[PDB]
């Protein structure tokens, strides 16, 4: 009866399990289950994500095993957090994550047990890394087609969510379905260490080991690697010294390009890496 703008609070642990369970199923679409708590109608949060076992029949409304749920919920009841399940998610690896006739068939099953049961779709493919990626859906009632279907209140998040639109298949879900916003929450402590873990991964353990191994490198074959840089500086420059003359022939910067052009920036940056890692010698080797 009451329809409002919605919001999904995700946990740092949740997304990581989403994209993993989805990566192992490629190409075939998997079946996950969303775990969290319903705080009210206009907001929702997902505090946990657990993986379901695959089946040979595939994604289906019968793919959820009741005995598996009671077992897993045993393991979650004895855990510090025995929170009730909320909704379900499935991966859509090879396309633009549109809900199919199989997804709707299990939507009406979750809407009778759970009032909301937010539908979530996650795919690793459509995003290299830094995208927020994922997706989220909600089933609107089809029997309401006689009354007003056009909420919400606080239309801000509605406007940013429906955008960009973004092709056609995405718009084909505006009817019978509506999306729901997603926003991260911190949890900034563990996030701080989670940054330093990957960053320190590139760093050494003792930190004096691989830098001194790059000092063993600092004269290898580095005089030979500097001969590699010397050949790039002869070969690229004697053909980039004809370019100031050719600029007088074409008059002046019309297309072009050749190329054979620039590329000395990378040569200077690699030579600068060489001279700095070499400058570490006098610091390290000495005391």
């Amino acid at each position: 009866a009451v329809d409002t703008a919605e919001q999904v609070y995700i946990s740092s642990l949740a997304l990581l399990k989403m994209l993993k369970h989805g990566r192992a199923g490629v190409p075939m679409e998997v079946m996950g289950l969303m775990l969290g708590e319903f705080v009210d109608d206009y907001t929702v949060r997902v505090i946990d994500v657990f993986a379901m076992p695959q089946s040979g029949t595939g994604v289906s409304v019968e793919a959820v095993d009741p005995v598996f749920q009671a077992k897993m919920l045993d393991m979650l009841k004895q855990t510090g957090r025995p929170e009730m399940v909320v909704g379900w998610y499935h991966s859509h690896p090879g396309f633009g994550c549109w809900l199919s006739g199989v997804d709707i068939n299990t939507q009406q099953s979750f809407e009778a047990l759970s009032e909301r049961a937010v539908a979530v779709v996650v795919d690793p493919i459509q995003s290299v890394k830094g995208k927020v990626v994922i997706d989220a859906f909600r089933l609107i009632n089809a029997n309401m087609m006689v009354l007003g279907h056009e909420p919400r209140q606080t239309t801000s998040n509605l406007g940013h969510l429906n955008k960009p639109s973004i092709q056609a298949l995405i718009h084909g879900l505006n009817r019978h379905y509506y999306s729901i916003t997603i926003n991260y929450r911190k949890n900034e402590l563990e996030q701080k260490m989670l940054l330093n873990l990957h960053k320190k991964s590139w760093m050494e353990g003792l930190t004096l080991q691989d830098y001194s191994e790059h000092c063993k490198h600092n004269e290898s074959v580095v005089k030979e690697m500097l001969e590699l840089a010397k050949n790039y500086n002869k070969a690229v420059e004697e053909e980039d010294k004809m370019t100031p003359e050719q600029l007088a022939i074409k008059n002046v910067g019309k297309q072009d390009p050749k190329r054979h052009l620039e590329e000395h920036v990378d040569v200077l940056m690699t030579s600068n890496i060489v001279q700095c890692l070499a400058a570490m010698l006098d610091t390290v080797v000495f005391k």
Binding site: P164, I166, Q167, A168
Partner: protein, 51 residues
């Protein structure tokens, strides 16, 4: 420069469903329409094109 990476997104959207074709005019017509023949396809006839 931040606007160019956004421009690639919108431009991608216009070229995504159909991109753009390559036509060959066999004849031009009096109604401002232009008979165009595509290599893989059959002959069309299409109009202004104000530019």
């Amino acid at each position: 420069l931040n606007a160019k990476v956004r421009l690639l997104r919108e431009e991608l959207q216009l070229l995504q469903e159909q991109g753009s074709y390559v036509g060959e005019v066999v004849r031009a017509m009096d109604k401002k329409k232009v008979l165009v023949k595509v290599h893989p396809e059959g002959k069309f006839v299409v109009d202004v094109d104000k530019n």
